[PDB]
């Protein structure tokens, strides 16, 4: 699917709009890098496709506070 998984950040669509204002359909893909996360509490080195910034959240909230929803949200993981 190519989603942020943690922020659901999917690839949006826009226009290149180069010089001369020439319109050209495109799309803005997120970041994602599938990071190795150590929940520790669960003693499991869980992994999942995240995305920069959207990953800065996993740190500000907590691998747990994050997985809080996610899993609860139904997301596999």
């Amino acid at each position: 699917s190519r989603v942020c998984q943690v922020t659901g950040k999917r690839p949006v669509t826009g226009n290149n709009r180069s010089h001369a204002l020439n319109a050209t359909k495109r799309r803005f893909l997120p970041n994602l890098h599938s990071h190795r996360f150590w929940v520790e509490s669960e003693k499991r080195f869980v992994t999942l496709r995240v995305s920069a910034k959207g990953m800065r959240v996993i740190d500000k909230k907590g691998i747990d506070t994050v997985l809080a929803e996610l899993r609860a949200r139904g997301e596999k993981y």
Binding site: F37, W38, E40, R56, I58, D59, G62
Partner: protein
């Protein structure tokens, strides 16, 4: 990313100490392993007195060695037999070990550490002012006198 160090952590770690760092260092090493932890308030606030548990909880409660300066000082006439030695010298060896537990009958037992005698007290009879060394700062007022039989 600040997090609280949990050990050596080279040029920054100080144990139970929190300092700045990089997210690349944390959530990749400083943490996943056992060397830090996020500074989400609780990590500090829920531990504000954690350091006071000793610098307070375990600091003022300690006054046993101190109370000696007054208690081990309120003794009535302190003197220890040092066995005379023909008007002058002595026969026995009265120094620290003695003026640091000469109270066995009173049950007020102690150690030979609490003593006030830099050097061995020559075999004389002078006012053996061997206070309690048990406490550093506030020592005590323990004496004794060279006696004999």
């Amino acid at each position: 990313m600040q997090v609280i160090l949990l050990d050596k952590v080279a040029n920054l770690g100080s144990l139970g100490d929190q300092v700045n760092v990089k997210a690349g260092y944390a959530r990749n090493f400083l943490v996943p392993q056992g060397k830090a932890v996020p500074a989400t308030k609780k990590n500090i606030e829920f531990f504000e007195a954690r350091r006071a548990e000793l610098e307070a909880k375990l600091a003022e409660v300690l006054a046993a060695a101190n109370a000696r300066a007054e208690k081990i000082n309120a003794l009535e006439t302190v003197t220890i037999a040092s066995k005379a030695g023909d008007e002058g010298k002595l026969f026995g060896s009265i120094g620290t070990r003695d003026i640091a537990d000469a109270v066995t009958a009173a049950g007020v037992e102690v150690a030979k550490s609490e003593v006030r005698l830099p050097n061995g007290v020559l075999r004389t009879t002078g006012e053996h002012e061997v206070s309690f060394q048990v406490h550093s700062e506030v020592f005590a007022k323990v004496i004794v006198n060279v006696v004999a039989e």
